[PDB]
Design a protein around this ligand. Structure first.
Ligand SMILES: CC(C)(C)c1ccc(O)c(C(C)(C)C)c1
Ligand SMILES: CC(C)(C)c1ccc(O)c(C(C)(C)C)c1
Lengths: 213, 10, 213, 10
């Protein structure tokens, strides 16, 4: 009703498109533009105060991009399919010194997404849950964000019960990828800060902006 | 945060 | 019958009890011994191979104790009750250089626990989900740890639905504190590695061991 | 990991 999963799906479908780290950073910068477009299509997001929109995306962008790259990659063996039509294989990530983080993405996200055949609706909903993070520092109205989160997961749950009546734990199994996503997010972010600090990797403007105070 | 604000307007 | 919430709650009840960093560290070393005992009272944990038990506890200890200090602190106004019976107030934390992280614990864990009146059964189930982390590296049998986790959360959901039938959302709400827990846990680890590195905080043996690679 | 192995064993 107020948080229709078909709209969340529509948001997902609407934005559908040398150095592995460089490619990743390049793909992330381009995908940040489309993430903004994605968020505007999440019911009620555009009705939040503009500062809260800014806060939710600054708090979530890395988790949200990781979620997308991971789900986009369920059809490949040991790599990630980035938005731009390029792949990054495990070996290539290992060769660039980011094998551990990359493997975590493969093992905790891509593989688990594949094993349960997480669909686009469930991904979108998980993403909207991540976007509506009421813990984000500075929100004008944390409770409204928590409410929107609640509406999303109520809808996701009903959706899973209807579409997967066979699997009573699927809803929880979905939500229980969120911690790994949080963790992997934080790690990918620290890597990124290091890349910027060292100056070893070109970082485009919107990605750069996301890494500013 | 220049770019994010701009892209959020239209 | 496979994973009874009564047994998880008995585990919780079975282990019920000058620098603030120093006090938190001492309490944590102490609590690590009790953590081992709690783990043994969690159904099927002791059936796991000894090395998998070691892996799960080394992966989860930081979160497990944070969850525990948090919940024990729901009746404390702006601080934390430690296992010792010592309280740490946020002013002390701030005055010790750990203000922000401490506040994150109060805001994202303690307060949220207090507002929803999370009970000791719910806590126990959440801690057991944390314990049975199927993503922990080197597990002999990841799928068996994921299956136990599933049994914990199935039993948690049935308990919340029976005890709080007015709150359809409670179960997902509980599980949605786990990303905050993961993040806070990671950040508390970083702090500890810094305290060990610079060496101005006495760290007792068990806490030191958990900090070794 | 001495201490953890010893506590778990007994
Ligand atoms: C592996 C994957 C493509 C998901 C990834 C790696 C590293 C990394 O920094 C990021 C960001 C989104 C934070 C840019 C994503
Ligand atoms: C605030 C609280 C007492 C939960 C805490 C602070 C810092 C900290 O490092 C830890 C550890 C468990 C990692 C020891 C706990």
């Amino acid at each position: 009703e107020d948080m229709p999963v078909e709209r969340i799906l529509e948001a997902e479908l609407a934005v559908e498109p040398n150095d592995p780290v460089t490619n990743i950073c390049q793909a992330a910068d381009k995908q940040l533009f489309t993430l903004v477009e994605w968020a505007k299509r999440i019911p009620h997001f555009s009705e939040l105060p503009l500062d809260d929109q800014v806060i939710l995306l600054r708090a979530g962008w890395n988790e949200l991009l990781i979620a997308s790259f991971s789900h986009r990659s369920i059809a490949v063996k040991d790599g990630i399919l980035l938005a731009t039509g390029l792949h990054v294989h495990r070996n290539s990530a290992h060769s660039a010194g980011v094998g551990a983080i990359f493997d975590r993405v493969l093992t905790e996200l891509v593989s688990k997404m594949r094993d349960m055949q997480m669909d686009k609706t469930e991904l979108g909903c998980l993403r909207a849950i991540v976007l509506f993070n009421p813990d984000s520092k500075g929100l004008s109205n944390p409770a409204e964000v928590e409410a929107l989160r609640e509406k999303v997961y109520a809808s996701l749950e009903a959706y899973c019960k209807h579409k997967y009546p066979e699997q009573p734990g699927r809803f929880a199994k979905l939500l229980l990828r969120l911690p790994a996503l949080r963790s992997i997010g934080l790690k990918c972010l620290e890597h990124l800060f290091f890349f910027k600090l060292i100056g070893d990797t070109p970082i485009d403007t919107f990605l750069m902006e996301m890494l500013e105070a | 945060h220049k770019i994010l604000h701009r892209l959020l307007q239209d």
